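Margin note from the TA: students keep mixing up input and output lines. Inputs are the sequences; the output is the structure of the whole complex. Example:
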Amino acid sequence: GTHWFVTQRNFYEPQIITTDNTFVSGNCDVVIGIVNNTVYDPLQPELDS
Amino acid sequence: GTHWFVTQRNFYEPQIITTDNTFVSGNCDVVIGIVNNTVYDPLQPELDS
Ligand SMILES: *[C@@H]1O[C@H](CO)[C@@H](O)[C@H](O)[C@H]1NC(C)=O
Ligand SMILES: *[C@@H]1O[C@H](CO)[C@@H](O)[C@H](O)[C@H]1NC(C)=O
Ligand SMILES: *[C@@H]1O[C@H](CO)[C@@H](O)[C@H](O)[C@H]1NC(C)=O
């Protein structure tokens, strides 16, 4: 309703949208119905130790 | 002709060969027809920067 998750199609198991749950292909002007949100990189938070 | 890419088998959508599109198993000794190239590591630019 407010947040976006990625889930398997046959069972609602919401997951945080990461760069390892998704793949990048193209630009943000060709997909009809695309939305804005943040893709969490699992590596940025821990590289700054 | 000069570069090496990895595509999906049914549609020509070339991508740069990285450590995300490929998996390692073995060495350059047993595979008949293996070709030298470079495998881009996404971790290096982010770690060096
Ligand atoms: C948000 O989406 C709009 C269109 O839906 C787009 O023009 C814009 O670049 C996106 N990102 C931001 C930060 O507004
Ligand atoms: C092969 O790789 C890319 C095609 O995306 C291009 O920069 C390069 O010039 C190509 N070389 C050819 C077609 O001989
Ligand atoms: C390039 O491939 C040849 C065989 O085709 C191999 O002998 C050589 O060691 C390879 N280059 C490197 C740097 O390993």
